[PDB]
Amino acid sequence: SWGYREHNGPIHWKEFFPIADGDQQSPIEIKTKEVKYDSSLRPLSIKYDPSSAKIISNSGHSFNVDFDDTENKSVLRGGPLTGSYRLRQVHLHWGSADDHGSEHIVDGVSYAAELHVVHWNSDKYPSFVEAAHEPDGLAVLGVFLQIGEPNSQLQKITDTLDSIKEKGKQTRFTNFDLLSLLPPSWDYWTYPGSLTVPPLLESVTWIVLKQPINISSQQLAKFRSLLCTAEGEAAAFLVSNHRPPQPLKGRKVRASFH
Ligand SMILES: NS(=O)(=O)c1c(F)c(F)c(S(=O)(=O)CCc2ccccc2)c(NCc2ccccc2)c1F
């Protein structure tokens, strides 16, 4: 029963998930003056098939778009990764107001929201759930969202939100154009970290894109009408679902670009 309310939110997660105070926790603050370009990163390769998307659901902590994950039709390769990481899921973090809501923060700048694209190493591991317990098991792309003119590529998502208002609701979601949610430039920072939700496993290679995409205020507010509660339960709203940055504790952040 972890969440982002007073009693169950990020400050208390260490109570049930001791790795919360680990050495490779996410998200982080990126201090660009201390980041080093790395010419050894390969081009990032994103191959995504809209037909791989299957369902969207309200997990109680965000919406999750889940992808068919026994095929290599949608994979992330290149960059800092060895081998092929299979697309598993997309979800979004925001705050209760537009001025902050991202998980990563760049030279003290906090965007309105942050989209995460979760992939796992099917070249080494038998399932997403196994790969989540391995250091090179997961790769997550982060995209920032900044308040600006509305983004038409969010429509397929926002159109489904009334249907998944309560925790545990789901609805069919295919032919999703994920590629078009990414910004035009894919320059990124990368570092070793963790899931930003319980169980907070340290199995993620983060790839955080420098260029934000837009969202309007009116679009972002729709996400905050989702509930963190199930049907028949006193309603509570998911107005904020972002973890604060954790300390780098010795890790260094690399950049794809100079
Ligand atoms: N913030 S994040 O991008 O790190 C991330 C993930 F990488 C991730 F894989 C997930 S998850 O839905 O696949 C659940 C995490 C997990 C992984 C392996 C074993 C157990 C749990 C969520 N979170 C969305 C979510 C949270 C809770 C319940 C259902 C979905 C998630 F938020």
Ligand SMILES: [Zn+2]
């Ligand atoms: Zn996330």
